[PDB]
Design an enzyme around this catalytic site. Structure first.
Site, PDB file in Angstrom:
ATOM      1  N   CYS B 111     -79.126 -22.449  76.097  1.00 26.91           N
ATOM      2  CA  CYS B 111     -79.289 -23.885  75.870  1.00 26.91           C
ATOM      3  C   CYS B 111     -79.573 -24.506  74.460  1.00 26.91           C
ATOM      4  O   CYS B 111     -80.602 -24.005  73.997  1.00 26.91           O
ATOM      5  CB  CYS B 111     -80.376 -24.541  76.798  1.00 26.91           C
ATOM      6  N   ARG B 114     -83.053 -27.337  73.943  1.00 24.71           N
ATOM      7  CA  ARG B 114     -84.488 -26.704  74.126  1.00 24.71           C
ATOM      8  C   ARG B 114     -85.499 -27.331  73.326  1.00 24.71           C
ATOM      9  O   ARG B 114     -86.714 -27.155  73.653  1.00 24.71           O
ATOM     10  CB  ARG B 114     -84.294 -25.267  73.988  1.00 24.71           C
ATOM     11  N   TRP B 283     -79.518 -34.222  79.521  1.00 23.76           N
ATOM     12  CA  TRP B 283     -78.272 -35.299  79.374  1.00 23.76           C
ATOM     13  C   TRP B 283     -77.164 -34.589  78.529  1.00 23.76           C
ATOM     14  O   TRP B 283     -77.496 -33.430  77.892  1.00 23.76           O
ATOM     15  CB  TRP B 283     -78.879 -36.378  78.120  1.00 23.76           C
ATOM     16  N   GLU B 288     -69.021 -30.928  75.705  1.00 25.85           N
ATOM     17  CA  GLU B 288     -68.903 -30.460  77.069  1.00 25.85           C
ATOM     18  C   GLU B 288     -67.983 -31.519  77.843  1.00 25.85           C
ATOM     19  O   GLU B 288     -67.168 -30.767  78.333  1.00 25.85           O
ATOM     20  CB  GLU B 288     -70.473 -30.683  77.721  1.00 25.85           C
TER      21      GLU B 288
END
Ligand code: HEM
Ligand code: HEM
Ligand SMILES: C[C@H](O)[C@H](O)[C@H]1CNc2nc(N)[nH]c(=O)c2N1
Ligand SMILES: C[C@H](O)[C@H](O)[C@H]1CNc2nc(N)[nH]c(=O)c2N1
Ligand SMILES: CC(=N)NCC[C@@H](F)C[C@H](N)C(=O)O
Ligand SMILES: CC(=N)NCC[C@@H](F)C[C@H](N)C(=O)O
Lengths: 413, 413
Positions: B111, B114, B283, B288
């Site tokens: 991720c 973070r 979010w 993506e």
């Protein structure tokens, strides 16, 4: 309590309680009464009930002979009695089975074609053991029966029920039937009557073509195992394209139907034994296709389109447009079959033949089980002679019974 | 033996045997390695292994306090030890759970977001008991998180795994995802990635709309019971319509995407306990949607259409048309989200933020587990600073693990 009543046109169910006030209800117009069904089992037929049925059947068989054979009769009685005691059941001789399949046909109250009862080809598949072997036997049956359009009546007898946990069953209602898909756009495509079974085949991995005349696959269950799906070889399915002798627009409808009427889900019962898988066939009666398959509101429902195309007063019932349309559709069906050299009989010639068969039966064995409600054609009722014939409906033995749908009574393991 | 290797673009699998000749293989680019998965169970966590994990976690929790609380720490250690002995497991205090959800996020190697780890809203649904109650908790989560476009990070913690035979599981991969249907005409419609799960929902009675952007239903499993299907209330699903700041033909594509990126199938692990159902969300990062969801050949595959519409040399790779197109699609995604006031961050600002987070983590606790392969954006790789940052990937605790797909490990009864 209440008696459940169903409307096959709308699928609606009603509960009858008022019959309780009856002076003495009649279940005459019930399609699937329990009296006509032979359900599944969990253990073999109790020896006490099987034995007397077997003796009765062997007596029936030996009584058929014009020239009696007492020694063989007594001997067979002895052997059968002993076999049932040494094994639990018994095996019919091929000759007894042939006799049984014919007597059962002869005892089917709902069949107009019974004048043909003695002309039946029997395929003995009692030694079958796998789905694959069933599929081959069926392809053999289809091929023999179709005979390039000169339809021949036949039946294939698979292994008899043993303990009820290892039986052979064809999950199809008929050997050849068309698929029914409820399209994404809300409309139903093809045969609405096979909607559920179509979903079953699709669930079992079958490939949906979404057409209006797609032949469904054979779903065969052998030795109580889970059913296996088999596509029927297109070369085996003989079809007839629909066209009217006049009205060249009829062919524009793009209608056709298979030539082989083969019941696939009935159970044969003889001398206490029950054969859960025994597909049989005869040939078509025009009204089955022309009136019911094409015109039932729950099947192809082509009445309005045909009426509209004939230029009839489609919006006013009193015009009797429905009457005029349905008759032209029957004409198309008979015309096409005859033109394409495929056996078929009209619902007049057949009614007359059933009437000849009936008089024959009365003098031969003093009776003929007849279900008036099924024997009278779906059109021209009082025009046919069977309409004016009083008949008695009763269940004899050997007999072809209905069965509960296998997907309802079956487990993965 | 051989190591199985997969190509997610073609679905092809290869078997690696050559690694056996290695001087000393690296499973770095493996999407779902066993080391990252926590499978199902058949009995409770052995007391011998659970206990030391629990003590470790309570020590971690109490070590977090700037101003230590020795008495409470020792007291909690005692109470937990005792509870595990008197019950078999133990319950985390709400404060410990909040801490656990954040540390697990803080420990997610894959991720980039973070830097936001400390800002997480926790919904305690540990007292939940039915599918219906799960559905309400989820609708509550979706509504809180969406916040009319001003996305807020949140997580809903359902009951922890007990004996492994009574766990809560969301069968969906994400709270909100689109359906994928393999149309009758051979083509795939919607999200190809959710093809199988779409069939599952349809099998479970869900109604297929056959669109290209149909929100799939929530498939919830509570207390190990069979899963129940729930349609997500349309009023809860906030979507963004795609349009380019220039190129007014972009909107003609009829593209859109949901605003809520919510992982629904991961397992939280903390102090020996495992929470099989704990949906969370942050979010979106523009790439993506713009690069992977729209441009993956296995997802929406809109690259050629966009290139063609831009008038690029679509048939000659060296023209770098793919590069030009994908960047315009990313521009569209960011533009639309920003115009419609929905939170989103581009893959540059985020990379830079991850880099700030990393330096923060190194001075705060001497480390940051990072999976370079997942952290580097799907476009502009070396342009982002994370590409030039050497990182060590390792698994800590608390941690979010993958799980085997529930339909693979589940029984009717
Ligand atoms: C050879 C010409 C034959 C003709 C024209 C004929 C015609 C018919 C017709 C019109 C029906 C009504 C079916 C329906 O309404 O759905 C029927 C039913 C039936 N027929 Fe015949 N049949 C013939 C041969 C056979 C044969 C060979 C057998 C058995 C070996 C047989 C057994 C039955 C049975 C048991 C029914 C059951 C109806 C049901 O309950 O579904 N038929 N037949
Ligand atoms: C708030 C902003 C956030 C952003 C922008 C962000 C962004 C990302 C991105 C870009 C990925 C890659 C996903 C993919 O390629 O499929 C990812 C994965 C992940 N994120 Fe974050 N995230 C955020 C919040 C969170 C939160 C709140 C949690 C946990 C509480 C979290 C947990 C993870 C985990 C565990 C993965 C797993 C990837 C996988 O293996 O499927 N993220 N995140
Ligand atoms: C009586 C019941 O309602 C049902 O409609 C019956 C009527 N008679 C029939 N007769 C035949 N030959 N085939 C049928 O399907 C029916 N349907
Ligand atoms: C490495 C594996 O083959 C797979 O393509 C990985 C690459 N890195 C990724 N990175 C992110 N963020 N998300 C992904 O799905 C992937 N896919
Ligand atoms: C053998 C015969 N003529 N019909 C039997 C019943 C069934 F096989 C036919 C059905 N009536 C059909 O129209 O498809
Ligand atoms: C939290 C976030 N930004 N992504 C996490 C992973 C998943 F929820 C999003 C997925 N990458 C999607 O594009 O639909």
């Amino acid at each position: 309590q209440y008696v459940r009543i169903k409307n096959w046109g709308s699928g609606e169910i009603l509960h009858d309680t008022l019959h309780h006030k009856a002076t003495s209800s009649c279940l005459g117009s019930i399609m699937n009464p329990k009296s006509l069904t032979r359900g599944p089992r969990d253990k073999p037929t109790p020896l006490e009930e099987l034995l007397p049925h077997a003796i009765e059947f062997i007596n029936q068989y030996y009584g058929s002979f014009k020239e009696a054979k007492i020694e063989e009769h007594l001997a067979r009685l002895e052997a059968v009695t002993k076999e049932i005691e040494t094994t639990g059941t018994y095996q019919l001789t091929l000759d007894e089975l042939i006799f049984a399949t014919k007597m059962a046909w002869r005892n089917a109250p709902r069949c107009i074609g019974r004048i043909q009862w003695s002309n039946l080809q029997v395929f003995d598949a009692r030694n079958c053991s796998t789905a694959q072997e069933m599929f081959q036997h069926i392809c053999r049956h289809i091929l023999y029966a179709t005979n390039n359009g000169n339809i021949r009546s036949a039946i294939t007898v698979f292994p008899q029920r043993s303990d009820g946990k290892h039986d052979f069953r064809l999950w199809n209602s008929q050997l050849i039937r068309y698929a029914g898909y409820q399209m994404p756009d809300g409309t139903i495509r093809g045969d609405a009557a096979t909607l559920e079974f179509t979903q079953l085949c699709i669930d079992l991995g079958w490939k949906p073509r979404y057409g209006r005349f797609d032949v469904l696959p054979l779903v065969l269950q052998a030795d109580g195992q889970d059913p296996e799906v088999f596509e029927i070889p297109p070369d085996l399915v003989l079809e007839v394209t629909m066209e009217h002798p006049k009205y060249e627009w009829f062919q524009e409808l793009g209608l056709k139907w298979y030539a082989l009427p083969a019941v696939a889900n009935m159970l044969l019962e003889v001398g206490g034994l029950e054969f859960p898988a025994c597909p049989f066939n005869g040939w078509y009666m025009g009204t089955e296709i022309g009136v019911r398959d094409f015109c039932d509101t729950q099947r192809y429902n082509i009445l309005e389109e045909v009426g509209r195309r004939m230029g009839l007063e489609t919006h006013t019932l009193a015009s009797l447009w429905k009457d005029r349309a349905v008759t032209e559709i029957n004409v198309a069906v008979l015309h096409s079959f005859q033109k394409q050299n495929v056996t078929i009989m009209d619902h007049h010639t057949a009614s007359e033949s059933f009437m000849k068969h009936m008089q024959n039966e009365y003098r031969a064995r003093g009776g003929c089980p007849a279900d008036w409600i099924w024997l009278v054609p779906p059109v021209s009722g009082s025009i046919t002679p069977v309409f004016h014939q009083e008949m008695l409906n009763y269940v004899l033995s050997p007999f072809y019974y209905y069965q509960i749908e296998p997907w309802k009574t079956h487990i993965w393991q």
